[PDB]
Ligand SMILES: *C1O[C@H](CO)[C@@H](O)[C@H](O)[C@H]1NC(C)=O
Ligand SMILES: *C1O[C@H](CO)[C@@H](O)[C@H](O)[C@H]1NC(C)=O
Ligand SMILES: *[C@@H]1O[C@H](CO)[C@@H](O)[C@H](O)[C@H]1NC(C)=O
Ligand SMILES: *[C@@H]1O[C@H](CO)[C@@H](O)[C@H](O)[C@H]1NC(C)=O
Ligand SMILES: *[C@@H]1O[C@H](CO)[C@@H](O)[C@H](O)[C@H]1NC(C)=O
Ligand SMILES: *[C@@H]1O[C@H](CO)[C@@H](O)[C@H](O)[C@H]1NC(C)=O
Ligand SMILES: OC[C@H]1N/C(=N\O)[C@H](O)[C@@H](O)[C@@H]1O
Ligand SMILES: OC[C@H]1N/C(=N\O)[C@H](O)[C@@H](O)[C@@H]1O
Ligand SMILES: O=C1O[C@H]([C@@H](O)CO)C(O)=C1O
């Protein structure tokens with residue numbers, strides 16, 4: 001019987017009690033990254049994260065930081081491999097920058113052979129060290145040309161451009177890459193990119209944020225989410241019909257959260273919590289497992305929710321060989337009004353729920369996850385059991401999928417000095433407490449989880465935060481980015497992997 | 500009788516001997532800038548200078564500097580006006596960033612009202628202080644979307660997109676702006692952007708520079724130059740047919756140089772010098788004054804030189820109300836081979852001339868203009884009499900045009916400290932020696948020159964050099980860009996203007 005801790009102090013950092021041998025022998029352990037966050041702009045075209053961070057610098061991060069140079073994994077990809085080799089990692093999730101291999105967006109405009117070579121060298125180097133690549137085709141960095149031609153995922157033209165891009169990736173890299181991710185966190189671009197305008201491309205309704213150049217927060221998230229599902233599904237169909245000889249697997253990435261009732265004896269809070277599961281997870285998982293959106297969304301969103309035709313429904317339904325599940329935290333849900341006629345209405349209000357980290361009796365859900373110095377009532381707290389709850393739910397609700405945990409991690413403040421930054425015991429606690437629950441859910445519920453990739457390999461540009469927070473298991477000095485030095489968490493993870 | 504100095508030491512910095520009263524009472528005196536170089540990316544879309552500087556950072560400058568924030572004239576435009584007011588300037592040349600008012604390039608995709616407002620406020624503020632705006636529509640900063648859709652000026656699609664952009668500028672600003680410049684230095688983008696790939700967009704033949712993403716240095720400069728002429732001429736026709744009620748004037752900007760024979764008793768050097776005038780100036784001035792390219796270019800460039808149809812020739816011929824002439828230096832010309840079959844052939848080799856600052860007997864043409872620390876034999880030297888020679892030539896060869904000197908200036912090293920940077924006596928010498936010759940050519944040759952705008956108002960991002968050189972008449976601290984402090988040159992210029 002496995003017992004896991006939910007509250008500080010944790011004792012799971014002792015590799016005598018928890019290590020890779022606790023899991024099945026074939027289980028993959030590694031770390032993850034994304035291209036905008038680590039490579040730099042050298043050698044690639046411009047994308048909407050370059051566009052957004054430069055047009056709206058105060059949205060890039062409080063320091064106005066961006067991915068222009070970051071940790072320069074364009075130059076130092078070998079040092080990334082060296083971190084993985086030091087960890088004895090068996091997996092690495094990275095993304096391909098569309099703007100690095102097709103700077104002009106549309107494949108018929110030509111490819112960047114040097115860009116293709118960069119990824120071939122990385123892939124070859126990973127395989128040479130026994131590391132399995134998990135490659136994300138689209139980690140938000142859409143070529144700026146496509147956003148300016150037709151507003152990117154707002155238009156159905158994205159489907160064929162994304163298909164042609166994916167086809168190029170499969171053709172060039174699929175002989176070596178056997179695990180592909182289509183779109184990173186389906187929920188995020190629709191809501192943050194087109195709803196609140198916190199993320200690229202930065203569209204929203206005028207009274208949501210007057211700085212947005214255009215948009216409609218009430219309708220655009222649904223349009224974009226729909227086109228993401230279609231684009232994803234066209235790419236999965238392309239992979240499974242034309243690249244079956246490669247013997248690999250493909251799936252989407254979902255951001256997962258668990259939801260608990262703000263008041264667990266209040267039927268209204270309990271209803272809000274179940275609506276949250278459907279609006280947060282079901283928005284994408286309904287289409288992926290059934291070809292339709294959840295009924296509550298159909299009912300609530302009405303004419304703002306697009307329909308799939310019978311052909312589209314069939315393309316989207318079952319369009320995965322596995323799911324990449326990212327997991328960071330859990331929220332309490334309580335009812336909230338949905339003012340659909342308000343000029344500041346957003347798609348996120350359609351769930352009719354307000355989310356918190358504190359419940360009605362004053363209980364904070366778990367340890368600190370992210371401090372918000374401008375408003376401390378907006379601090380985020382984590383909940384190790386949430387990874388158990390999420391995995392169990394996916395198995396039971398979503399037809400026992402094959403799952404890889406494609407992100408899990410925690411930040412530490414960028415104001416800490418190097419010594420403090422390297423002594424990242426809060427990161428060991430977060431990682432180990434989640435891995436304990438992940439082992440427990442695999443053993444108790446028989447969820448088909450086959451690997452775990454911690455966010456992040458190294459410190460990088462964090463979307464929305466610049467360099468003001470650090471997520472790496474390895475430290476990077478921003479005054480001299482060459483080295484990636486294992487922190488206490490990286491050192492712990494090395495011992496966990498090879499106890 | 501006016502006597503001007505050609506060699507150090509100069510004595511024209513004494514405003515008792517040379518001042519604005521030396522010139523006609525209506526003569527305009529001011530300074531110039533360009534949008535990429537001063538504004539920052541905040542509030543605009545991305546252009547090919549953003550693209551180029553980020554994709555090829557070592558081409559942006561030795562410091563890898565770019566126009567991301569620069570002197571932040573987006574925020575501090577009022578401080579620019581304050582410099583002009585301090586100078587008692589009567590003119591200011593600035594450019595409109597196409598990506599600030601039409602971020603998506605094509606006008607039918609929408610306009611950025613906030614971008615339009617930025618220029619309305621600047622214009623209003625200039626007029627309120629009695630400063631005449633001279634506005635450049637295109638100072639190289641093409642929206643990146645247009646370069647990625649169709650390779651910008653390489654394709655005839657640029658003509659209508661540039662026309663629609665210009666139309667928007669005339670509509671929004673032409674009630675207040677009465678002097679418009681179309682394209683900055685016609686010669687530069689074809690040769691540096693598409694020939695040597697020193698400038699955006701960075702196209703060239705593979706063996707000219709293997710880093711270029713695509714191109715052909717032998718043919719593309721001619722295609723781009725041709726489309727620049729057509730785009731320019733369509734915009735001038737639009738202005739003169741649809742905006743005549745505004746009572747303003749429009750013209751192109753030429754980069755001018757004078758050319759002298761490397762050996763003035765050698766017929767081959769003398770021929771090379773005359774070929775240089777035709778290939779450097781006539782490439783554009785032939786079409787602008789006659790609707791045809793110079794015969795020597797027709798003969799040499801052959802099938803690589805595009806033809807104008809009768810309609811195009813008529814559109815281009817006479818497509819100016821005045822010429823904006825930029826002038827910085829003069830070169831000696833000697834013969835050089837033109838290896839048209841070489842894979843590294845460039846359009847610049849077609850003139851059959853090698854250019855130097857030292858003649859055959861060892862004479863350097865004038866004082867130091869730009870030191871090149873990597874190769875000192877590549878140092879640039881200036882020649883004050885060249886502005887007299889250029890103006891005289893334009894009058895005599897090119898039908899006595901109305902001219903405004905739209906740039907003239909010199910850099911000082913970015914390695915100097917603030918005190919050294921502020922004591923910019925080399926800049927007073929350069930400016931005054933050129934103004935002496937400009938007064939002399941107006942008086943002796945009756946050239947119709949009506950204003951002079953010194954490069955630059957303040958320190959800025961210099962194309963190709965980052966922040967490693969300074970050109971301002973006012974100093975900017977890169978650790979805190981708010982202030983623009985008049986240097987000794989700015990202080991001198993103030994006394995020259997109001998003696
Ligand atoms: C930040 O930038 C936007 C312009 O992009 C501006 O509208 C907003 O007021 C600024 N935010 C703050 C908090 O100052
Ligand atoms: C600079 O960058 C380019 C890649 O953009 C590279 O090909 C070239 O070698 C580098 N130049 C020098 C002098 O190192
Ligand atoms: C607009 O929404 C904000 C936050 O969503 C809220 O504080 C405000 O009350 C809303 N205004 C109206 C008119 O509903
Ligand atoms: C920066 O980091 C690398 C690796 O530690 C080191 O070898 C190099 O000397 C350092 N550069 C400077 C300028 O300190
Ligand atoms: C290529 O041109 C470079 C400079 O233009 C020159 O040094 C070299 O000799 C040329 N090579 C050939 C094969 O002509
Ligand atoms: C920077 O420059 C402006 C103008 O001189 C000054 O008012 C401001 O205090 C300075 N900011 C800092 C942080 O030094
Ligand atoms: O915030 C941590 C990490 N989280 C992720 N999603 O939750 C993103 O996919 C990744 O790009 C981001 O850096
Ligand atoms: O090099 C000085 C100056 N020279 C100019 N041309 O010669 C450019 O138009 C301007 O953008 C550049 O900064
Ligand atoms: O729950 C979530 O986690 C992440 C991130 O906030 C972790 O820092 C994200 O992108 C969500 O939507």
Ligand SMILES: O=C1O[C@H]([C@@H](O)CO)C(O)=C1O
Nearest residue numbers: 684687754755756826827828
């Ligand atoms: O003669 C010329 O002068 C400028 C510049 O080099 C001055 O620094 C330029 O763009 C030319 O072609």
Ligand SMILES: [Zn+2]
Nearest residue numbers: 054068553567
């Ligand atoms: Zn940048």
